[PDB]
Amino acid sequence: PTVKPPTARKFIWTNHKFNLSGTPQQYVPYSTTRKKIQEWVPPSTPYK
Amino acid sequence: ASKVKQDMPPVGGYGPIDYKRNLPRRGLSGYSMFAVGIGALLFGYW
Amino acid sequence: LVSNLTLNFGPQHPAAHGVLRLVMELSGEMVRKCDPHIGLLHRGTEKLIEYKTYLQALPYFDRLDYVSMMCNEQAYSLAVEKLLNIRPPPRAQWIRVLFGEITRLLNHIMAVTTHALDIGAMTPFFWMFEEREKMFEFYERVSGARMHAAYVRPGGVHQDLPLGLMDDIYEFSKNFSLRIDELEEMLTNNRIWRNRTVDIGIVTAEDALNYGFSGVMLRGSGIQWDLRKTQPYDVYDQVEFDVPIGSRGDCYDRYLCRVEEMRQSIRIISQCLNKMPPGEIKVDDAKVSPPKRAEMKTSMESLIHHFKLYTEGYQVPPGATYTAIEAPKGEFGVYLVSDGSSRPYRCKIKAPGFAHLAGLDKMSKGHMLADVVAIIGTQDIVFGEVDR
Amino acid sequence: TYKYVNLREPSMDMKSVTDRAAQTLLWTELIRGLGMTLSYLFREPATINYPFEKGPLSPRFRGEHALRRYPSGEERCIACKLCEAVCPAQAITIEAEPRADGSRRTTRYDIDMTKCIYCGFCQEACPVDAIVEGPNFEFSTETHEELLYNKEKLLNNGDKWEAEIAANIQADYLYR
Amino acid sequence: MFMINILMLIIPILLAVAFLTLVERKVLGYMQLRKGPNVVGPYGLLQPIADAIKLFIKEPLRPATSSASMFILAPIMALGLALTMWIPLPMPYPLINMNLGVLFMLAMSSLAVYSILWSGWASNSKYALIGALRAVAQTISYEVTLAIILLSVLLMSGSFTLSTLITTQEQMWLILPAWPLAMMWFISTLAETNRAPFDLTEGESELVSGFNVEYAAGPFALFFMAEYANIIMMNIFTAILFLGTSHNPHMPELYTINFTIKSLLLTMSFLWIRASYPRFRYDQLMHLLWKNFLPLTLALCMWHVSLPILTSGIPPQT
Amino acid sequence: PSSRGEYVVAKLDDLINWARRSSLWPMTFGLACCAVEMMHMAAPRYDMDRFGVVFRASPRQSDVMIVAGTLTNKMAPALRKVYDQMPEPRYVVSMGSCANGGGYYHYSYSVVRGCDRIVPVDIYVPGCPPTAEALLYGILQLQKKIKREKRLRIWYRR
Amino acid sequence: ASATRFIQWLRNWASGRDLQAKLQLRYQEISKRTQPPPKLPVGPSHKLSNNYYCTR
Ligand SMILES: CCCCCCCCCCCCCCCCCC(=O)OC[C@H](COP(=O)(O)OCCN)OC(=O)CCCCCCCCCCCCCCCCC
Ligand SMILES: C[C@H](CCC(=O)O)[C@H]1CC[C@H]2[C@@H]3[C@H](O)C[C@@H]4C[C@H](O)CC[C@]4(C)[C@H]3C[C@H](O)[C@]12C
Ligand code: SF4
Ligand code: SF4
Ligand code: SF4
């Protein structure tokens, strides 16, 4: 890389991180979508 | 652009490649080996 | 039935062929009955292929005989191409023979060395996997994967040979006959090895054919049969090589046949390197083969064919074919049925190891228990293809 | 065209018979086998010093997956779902919607790395070079959950490995 | 001073067995084009310690043993006999100077098959026993030719004193006059210790389980120490018997050096042979003895009784 | 000299950990393809023995089980049998997609969808197959995992 | 390759082969890892005329 440097992009990481498995920085999967069906919210109004 | 540039053999082909079995024959004949063995016994006995 | 010894290779040793449960009746040291139980690596491969397009199904064929990855691919590709009625271009046919013979060398090193390793001769195993490791680099340079290349596809090959590959293959092939010679300096004339293989597991020519044997299992018994010579399929009619033939039908002749096949593979590889022609690598027909990534981003028709090829897939005309090749282990064939859509209707895989293993009981009769290890080894059984 | 691997007839002269007698009694071939093993003891080992030394790879190597970006920083993926359709293992799950600026972008991109066969069909099928298999092959984890990649993980891999990935594409895109 | 001299023999033996395991793995590696242990300590010099500490903290297996007594005797008998075989060896002076040292060693090694037999019978598995019985028949078989070969050699030494073998070879190694016997001796020490191409115990483990299958890490590690102790001792004995070093009473340590180097080179020839040949089948290693070695060993025993008489070269009795 | 109990336990813990990771004898189920890459990890180029990892270990002297290939339903009982016979401490290494979660037969009727349904797994090695180097990285990750164990230190505070 | 001449003589003699001619290891007879860019050919159907798909 000294002779042939890699192209510079602003989004590229500056600080390389090693395998973080088994540490408090490990990757935990999760769903990245929002709730599908919205539930009807009962009125706070009490009238009967 | 430049004429097609592909992975091709060098002009003239590659050099010959050996494929045939080659176990080189070594050692002294049958008679000689026994003589050397028997000669050692006689020297040891003497 | 003095005693029944249910021998499970469940606690597997360094063989990697798979796992075999063997149920035997030992009337002393001798073996009276042998009964292989072979469900342990059954993965439902033939049913899974029915839910995949023809392209999606190809990687399944890498994972059958997982020491003959690119030879299994060629059989699938030759079957699909036959139904498609297309032809791969001449350069790809040479690349598929070239890597078909690099795969034969890969298979025989595993076959001979692990056969010898089970019979106690551990060292040649390490000598030769330094060579297989160098062959795994050829696989990775053309496909990006050391083992399951997914490189031979209907219509030709995925990509062209990178510049500088053929020189490295020639350098490997130039030093390789000496490696085989070292192996024979340790086994061919070794009295211990001969005592463990000579007149073991003898098979007569008549019983070989009726039991369905193929490959070395026939030629060890003296049958002059090789699919590359009698039913050639790529450019094998354009390369000179000799078929090794046995005379006694025992393990030792089968061991000699494989070692001589490695030499003939190097002979063939030499001719492929010199005769490699120029041109394209996949059939120039974009309703079957995807177009180049440059054309797909420039041409409307190429983008449409790219889009459909990687979603629906190309449709194959209705029909049924049985295609077989001379795989390293034997005759590897696929019976492929097309219903006209883009997904196969039925894909039956003909594994040479399926018949050979079924013929174990026949061969083991009247042999000691320690011979059975030698008999299974000389058959060259991998349970990826036995079970599918 | 065939050859005979073992059809010799041993000579029955006394000189030849004595040669086999000397071989049988003096263990000649067995000594020869000991010679070959002795020669290897003085040959240099093929071992390399992992992890300080690494085995050679190529630009085409198929490793960990990552999602890429354009030079500007916009994600290359347009949610066409061609990778999801081709994936032989059904390892990819995609959902999409119109982004706040009306762009065609995914809201879910997942790869079950325990389903994936690392075949690289998805990068062959992508029209915009958005999904790639990177050069990383050292990402083994301690738990199964750490191998189910969502969109953030694959975007982070692209940000992490873009420097190398771009060079590898540069080296091989003409073959592709 | 004698108690010290015993511990100057027992402890160094255990350490040599500890570091024979490193030497075995490295010599096999380089013959297989690899390095072998070289990470744990410099050049793998701590590999034996890590293996030793690892095994003794390992959870024991479940004994499930038919005879508890014979379960604990087998390792004690094997380990104790292996250490006892070293007391008469002249290096150049024996720890115990016996007038019948050769018969003491021959007689003691004959008891080493009880460890094999007991552990198999105490194992509680029917296939384990048939493994032990197969091994015993191999051990006692190759004892026959060892005794006859040893008898033939001692007819040119003239005594059972092990220190008299040094005097016999003062002018020349017994490898010259007795190379046909040295060949069959060297093989029989391979088969005696159950070493490749005769290690049918390990090779046919799946077919027939070995006798040492039932012992835990600690107890099994002790069976293994006794086994390499015998292998070192049988090559030390091979060196004294056929490659006798000259003794200079003013410089005994020169004997101990030249003697030690010859012992290693034969001990590493065991490793060399293990890396070169495939294993024998059981009926083939019985064929090798009862039908090849024994006829020749008997013929050479007849020859080595007649030869001293017909050449007027009978050795002294004292 | 002077030393606390906490200091003694920390140093003894480092000793046993160093021994256990320095001498890892692996049992290998070579179920399918991934066994071929396990064999390449033993060949000259990588040579796992140079780390103290023996080529072949019996099930009842083994320290780590490496599951290298597809675990079918017919085979699952046998694998759990072998796992129970292994003396502790025992670790499982899951090698490749098939063992990790079923892989490319995940939707099969005859395949266990991951070997963690049968046995506890310590390290997961991705790939189809993982390269011999990728498996070696996994084993070296198990050595570091063992290095961080605190069995004695926990025992002291019980 | 860096073996002294004596050790070269020994291993040649033991194996009976001139091992130095065909060494198992690779040094600098291998291809360069960086290679010039390629220019792959087009197939026989890359024609601008007389190229109707119905005839192929
Ligand atoms: C003047 C009168 C004087 C009296 C004597 C005159 C005549 C002398 C000439 C005769 C010499 C006798 C030779 C003695 C050696 C023993 C011979 C022998 O037994 O070899 C045959 C044996 C099996 O024979 P086989 O190959 O199976 O043939 C089929 C069976 N008919 O084959 C085997 O042994 C197989 C052995 C397999 C294990 C070998 C592994 C080690 C090999 C390398 C070791 C090299 C030698 C080590 C030397 C150590 C010395 C310290
Ligand atoms: C038992 C002994 C520890 C005794 C001691 O040094 O005091 C240890 C140290 C090194 C060990 C050996 C090596 O570490 C590994 C060898 C390889 C195979 O797994 C068989 C066991 C094997 C042959 C081991 C047997 C035994 O457990 C050994 C010999
Ligand atoms: S590499 Fe193959 S299996 Fe893996 S996600 Fe891409 S297409 Fe699917
Ligand atoms: S990664 Fe590529 S193929 Fe997959 S949805 Fe995005 S743009 Fe389409
Ligand atoms: S993960 Fe891949 S290489 Fe491993 S067994 Fe499964 S299909 Fe074969």
Coordinates of C-alpha atoms in Angstrom, one line a residue, chain E:
Chain E
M1 CA 24.4 -42.7 48.5
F2 CA 22.7 -45.6 46.8
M3 CA 19.3 -44.2 47.3
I4 CA 20.6 -41.1 45.5
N5 CA 22.0 -43.2 42.8
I6 CA 18.6 -44.8 42.2
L7 CA 17.0 -41.4 41.8
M8 CA 19.8 -40.5 39.5
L9 CA 18.4 -43.3 37.3
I10 CA 14.6 -43.1 37.8
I11 CA 14.1 -39.4 37.4
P12 CA 16.3 -39.0 34.3
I13 CA 14.4 -41.9 32.7
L14 CA 11.1 -40.2 33.1
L15 CA 12.4 -36.9 31.7
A16 CA 13.9 -38.8 28.7
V17 CA 10.5 -40.4 28.1
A18 CA 8.9 -37.0 28.4
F19 CA 11.1 -35.5 25.7
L20 CA 11.1 -38.5 23.5
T21 CA 7.5 -37.6 22.8
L22 CA 8.6 -34.2 21.5
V23 CA 11.4 -35.7 19.5
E24 CA 9.0 -38.3 18.0
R25 CA 6.6 -35.6 16.8
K26 CA 9.3 -33.4 15.3
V27 CA 11.2 -36.2 13.6
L28 CA 7.9 -37.5 12.1
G29 CA 7.0 -34.0 11.0
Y30 CA 10.2 -33.3 9.1
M31 CA 10.0 -36.6 7.4
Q32 CA 6.5 -35.5 6.4
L33 CA 7.7 -32.1 5.2
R34 CA 6.4 -30.2 8.2
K35 CA 7.8 -28.7 11.4
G36 CA 6.0 -30.5 14.2
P37 CA 5.7 -28.8 17.6
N38 CA 7.4 -25.4 17.6
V39 CA 5.0 -23.0 19.4
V40 CA 4.8 -24.1 23.0
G41 CA 8.2 -23.1 24.3
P42 CA 11.1 -22.4 22.0
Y43 CA 11.2 -25.2 19.4
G44 CA 8.5 -27.0 21.3
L45 CA 10.6 -27.5 24.4
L46 CA 7.5 -27.1 26.6
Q47 CA 5.2 -29.4 24.7
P48 CA 5.9 -32.4 27.0
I49 CA 5.1 -30.2 30.1
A50 CA 1.8 -28.9 28.6
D51 CA 0.7 -32.4 27.6
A52 CA 1.6 -33.8 31.1
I53 CA -0.2 -31.1 33.0
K54 CA -3.2 -31.3 30.6
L55 CA -3.7 -35.0 31.2
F56 CA -3.5 -35.1 35.0
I57 CA -6.1 -32.4 35.4
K58 CA -8.3 -34.1 32.9
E59 CA -11.6 -35.6 34.2
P60 CA -11.2 -39.3 34.7
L61 CA -13.1 -41.8 32.6
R62 CA -15.6 -44.0 34.4
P63 CA -13.7 -47.2 35.4
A64 CA -16.7 -49.6 34.9
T65 CA -14.1 -52.3 35.7
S66 CA -14.8 -55.9 36.3
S67 CA -11.9 -56.3 38.8
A68 CA -10.8 -53.2 40.7
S69 CA -7.6 -54.9 42.0
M70 CA -6.4 -55.9 38.5
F71 CA -7.3 -52.4 37.3
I72 CA -4.7 -50.8 39.6
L73 CA -2.1 -53.6 39.3
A74 CA -1.8 -53.4 35.6
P75 CA -0.3 -49.8 35.5
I76 CA 1.7 -50.4 38.6
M77 CA 3.2 -53.6 37.2
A78 CA 4.0 -52.1 33.9
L79 CA 5.5 -48.9 35.3
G80 CA 7.5 -50.7 38.0
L81 CA 8.9 -53.4 35.6
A82 CA 10.0 -50.8 33.1
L83 CA 12.0 -48.9 35.7
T84 CA 13.4 -52.2 37.0
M85 CA 14.8 -53.2 33.6
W86 CA 17.3 -50.4 33.9
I87 CA 19.1 -51.4 37.1
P88 CA 21.6 -53.9 35.5
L89 CA 22.6 -51.9 32.4
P90 CA 26.3 -51.0 32.3
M91 CA 26.7 -47.3 31.4
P92 CA 29.5 -48.2 31.9
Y93 CA 28.9 -49.4 35.5
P94 CA 25.6 -51.0 36.4
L95 CA 23.5 -49.7 39.3
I96 CA 23.3 -53.4 40.5
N97 CA 26.2 -55.5 39.2
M98 CA 24.6 -58.9 38.5
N99 CA 26.4 -62.1 37.4
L100 CA 23.2 -63.1 35.5
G101 CA 22.2 -59.7 34.2
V102 CA 21.1 -60.9 30.8
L103 CA 18.8 -63.6 32.3
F104 CA 17.5 -61.0 34.8
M105 CA 16.5 -58.7 32.0
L106 CA 15.1 -61.5 29.9
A107 CA 13.2 -62.9 32.9
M108 CA 11.8 -59.4 33.9
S109 CA 10.6 -58.6 30.4
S110 CA 8.7 -61.8 30.3
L111 CA 6.6 -60.5 33.2
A112 CA 5.6 -57.4 31.2
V113 CA 2.8 -59.3 29.4
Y114 CA 0.9 -59.4 32.7
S115 CA 0.1 -55.7 32.5
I116 CA -1.4 -56.3 29.0
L117 CA -3.3 -59.4 30.2
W118 CA -4.6 -57.8 33.5
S119 CA -5.8 -54.5 32.0
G120 CA -7.7 -56.4 29.3
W121 CA -9.4 -58.7 31.7
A122 CA -10.1 -55.8 34.1
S123 CA -11.5 -53.7 31.2
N124 CA -15.0 -55.2 31.3
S125 CA -15.5 -55.1 27.5
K126 CA -15.4 -58.3 25.5
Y127 CA -13.7 -56.8 22.5
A128 CA -11.1 -55.2 24.8
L129 CA -10.1 -58.6 26.0
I130 CA -9.7 -60.0 22.4
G131 CA -7.5 -57.1 21.8
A132 CA -5.4 -58.0 24.9
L133 CA -5.2 -61.6 23.9
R134 CA -4.1 -60.7 20.3
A135 CA -1.4 -58.5 21.7
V136 CA -0.2 -61.1 24.2
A137 CA 0.2 -63.7 21.6
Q138 CA 2.4 -61.2 19.7
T139 CA 4.5 -60.4 22.7
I140 CA 5.3 -63.9 23.8
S141 CA 5.8 -65.0 20.2
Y142 CA 8.7 -62.5 19.6
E143 CA 10.2 -63.3 23.0
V144 CA 11.0 -66.7 21.6
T145 CA 13.4 -65.4 19.0
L146 CA 14.8 -62.8 21.3
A147 CA 15.8 -65.5 23.8
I148 CA 17.3 -67.7 21.1
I149 CA 19.1 -64.8 19.4
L150 CA 20.4 -63.6 22.8
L151 CA 21.5 -67.2 23.5
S152 CA 23.5 -67.2 20.2
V153 CA 25.2 -63.9 21.0
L154 CA 26.2 -65.0 24.5
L155 CA 28.1 -67.9 23.0
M156 CA 30.7 -65.4 21.8
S157 CA 30.7 -63.4 25.0
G158 CA 30.9 -66.4 27.4
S159 CA 28.8 -65.1 30.2
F160 CA 25.4 -63.6 31.3
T161 CA 27.2 -60.6 32.8
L162 CA 26.2 -57.5 30.9
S163 CA 29.6 -55.9 31.6
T164 CA 31.3 -58.8 29.9
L165 CA 29.6 -57.8 26.6
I166 CA 31.8 -54.7 26.7
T167 CA 35.0 -56.7 27.0
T168 CA 33.9 -59.0 24.2
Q169 CA 33.5 -56.1 21.8
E170 CA 36.7 -54.3 22.9
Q171 CA 38.4 -55.2 19.5
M172 CA 35.3 -55.0 17.2
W173 CA 31.6 -54.6 17.3
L174 CA 29.5 -57.7 17.4
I175 CA 27.6 -56.2 14.5
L176 CA 30.2 -57.7 12.2
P177 CA 30.2 -61.4 13.3
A178 CA 26.5 -61.3 14.0
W179 CA 24.8 -59.1 11.5
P180 CA 22.2 -61.8 10.5
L181 CA 21.3 -62.0 14.2
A182 CA 21.3 -58.2 14.6
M183 CA 18.7 -57.9 11.8
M184 CA 16.3 -60.2 13.5
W185 CA 17.0 -58.9 16.9
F186 CA 16.2 -55.3 15.9
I187 CA 12.9 -56.3 14.3
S188 CA 11.9 -58.4 17.4
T189 CA 12.4 -55.4 19.6
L190 CA 10.0 -53.5 17.3
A191 CA 7.4 -56.3 17.7
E192 CA 8.2 -56.7 21.4
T193 CA 7.3 -53.1 22.1
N194 CA 4.3 -53.1 19.7
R195 CA 5.8 -50.6 17.3
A196 CA 5.1 -49.9 13.7
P197 CA 4.8 -51.9 11.4
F198 CA 3.8 -54.1 14.4
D199 CA 1.5 -51.7 16.3
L200 CA -1.6 -53.7 15.7
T201 CA -3.0 -52.5 19.0
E202 CA -3.3 -48.9 17.8
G203 CA -4.0 -49.6 14.1
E204 CA -6.9 -52.1 14.6
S205 CA -8.5 -50.1 17.4
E206 CA -11.8 -49.8 15.5
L207 CA -11.8 -53.4 14.5
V208 CA -10.7 -54.7 17.9
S209 CA -10.4 -52.3 20.8
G210 CA -7.0 -52.1 22.5
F211 CA -6.4 -53.3 26.0
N212 CA -5.6 -49.7 27.3
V213 CA -9.0 -48.3 26.2
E214 CA -10.5 -48.1 29.7
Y215 CA -8.0 -46.1 31.7
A216 CA -8.3 -42.4 32.5
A217 CA -5.9 -39.7 31.4
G218 CA -3.6 -40.0 34.4
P219 CA -3.5 -43.8 34.5
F220 CA -3.3 -44.1 30.7
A221 CA -0.5 -41.6 30.7
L222 CA 1.4 -44.0 33.0
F223 CA 0.9 -46.9 30.7
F224 CA 2.5 -44.8 28.0
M225 CA 5.5 -43.8 30.0
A226 CA 6.3 -47.4 30.8
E227 CA 6.0 -48.2 27.0
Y228 CA 8.6 -45.6 25.9
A229 CA 10.8 -46.5 28.9
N230 CA 11.0 -50.0 27.4
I231 CA 11.7 -48.6 23.9
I232 CA 14.6 -46.6 25.2
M233 CA 15.8 -49.5 27.2
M234 CA 15.6 -52.0 24.4
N235 CA 17.7 -49.7 22.2
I236 CA 20.2 -49.2 25.0
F237 CA 20.4 -53.0 25.2
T238 CA 20.7 -53.2 21.4
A239 CA 23.7 -50.8 21.6
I240 CA 25.5 -52.7 24.4
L241 CA 24.7 -56.1 22.7
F242 CA 25.9 -55.3 19.2
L243 CA 27.6 -51.9 19.2
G244 CA 29.8 -52.1 22.3
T245 CA 31.6 -48.9 23.2
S246 CA 35.1 -49.1 24.5
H247 CA 35.6 -48.4 28.2
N248 CA 38.5 -46.4 29.5
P249 CA 38.4 -46.8 33.3
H250 CA 40.1 -43.5 33.8
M251 CA 37.6 -41.7 31.6
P252 CA 34.3 -43.4 32.1
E253 CA 32.3 -40.4 30.9
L254 CA 33.7 -40.9 27.4
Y255 CA 31.9 -44.3 27.4
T256 CA 28.7 -42.6 28.6
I257 CA 28.8 -40.1 25.7
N258 CA 29.6 -42.5 22.9
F259 CA 27.2 -45.0 24.4
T260 CA 24.4 -42.4 24.7
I261 CA 24.7 -41.3 21.1
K262 CA 24.4 -44.8 19.9
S263 CA 21.3 -45.3 22.0
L264 CA 19.6 -42.2 20.6
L265 CA 20.4 -43.1 17.0
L266 CA 18.8 -46.5 17.4
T267 CA 15.9 -44.9 19.3
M268 CA 15.4 -42.5 16.4
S269 CA 15.6 -45.3 13.9
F270 CA 12.4 -46.6 15.6
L271 CA 10.8 -43.2 14.6
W272 CA 12.4 -43.5 11.2
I273 CA 10.9 -46.9 10.6
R274 CA 7.5 -45.8 11.8
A275 CA 7.4 -43.1 9.1
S276 CA 8.4 -45.4 6.3
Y277 CA 6.2 -48.6 6.1
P278 CA 2.6 -49.7 6.3
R279 CA 1.3 -51.9 9.1
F280 CA 1.5 -55.6 9.2
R281 CA -1.7 -57.7 9.3
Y282 CA -1.9 -60.0 12.3
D283 CA -1.5 -63.3 10.5
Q284 CA 1.4 -61.7 8.6
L285 CA 3.4 -60.8 11.7
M286 CA 2.8 -64.3 13.0
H287 CA 3.9 -65.7 9.7
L288 CA 7.1 -63.6 9.9
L289 CA 8.1 -65.2 13.2
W290 CA 7.0 -68.8 13.2
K291 CA 7.9 -69.3 9.6
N292 CA 10.8 -66.9 8.8
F293 CA 12.6 -65.7 11.9
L294 CA 12.3 -68.9 14.0
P295 CA 13.8 -71.2 11.3
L296 CA 16.7 -68.8 10.8
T297 CA 17.2 -68.2 14.5
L298 CA 17.4 -71.9 15.1
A299 CA 19.8 -72.4 12.2
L300 CA 22.1 -69.6 13.4
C301 CA 21.9 -70.9 17.0
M302 CA 23.2 -74.2 15.7
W303 CA 25.8 -72.3 13.8
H304 CA 26.9 -70.2 16.7
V305 CA 27.3 -73.2 19.0
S306 CA 29.4 -75.0 16.4
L307 CA 31.5 -72.1 15.2
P308 CA 33.4 -71.3 18.5
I309 CA 34.4 -75.0 18.7
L310 CA 35.6 -75.4 15.1
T311 CA 37.7 -72.2 15.2
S312 CA 39.1 -72.7 18.7
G313 CA 37.6 -69.4 19.7
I314 CA 35.6 -70.4 22.8
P315 CA 35.3 -67.4 25.1
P316 CA 36.4 -67.5 28.7
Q317 CA 33.9 -68.5 31.4
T318 CA 35.1 -65.8 33.8

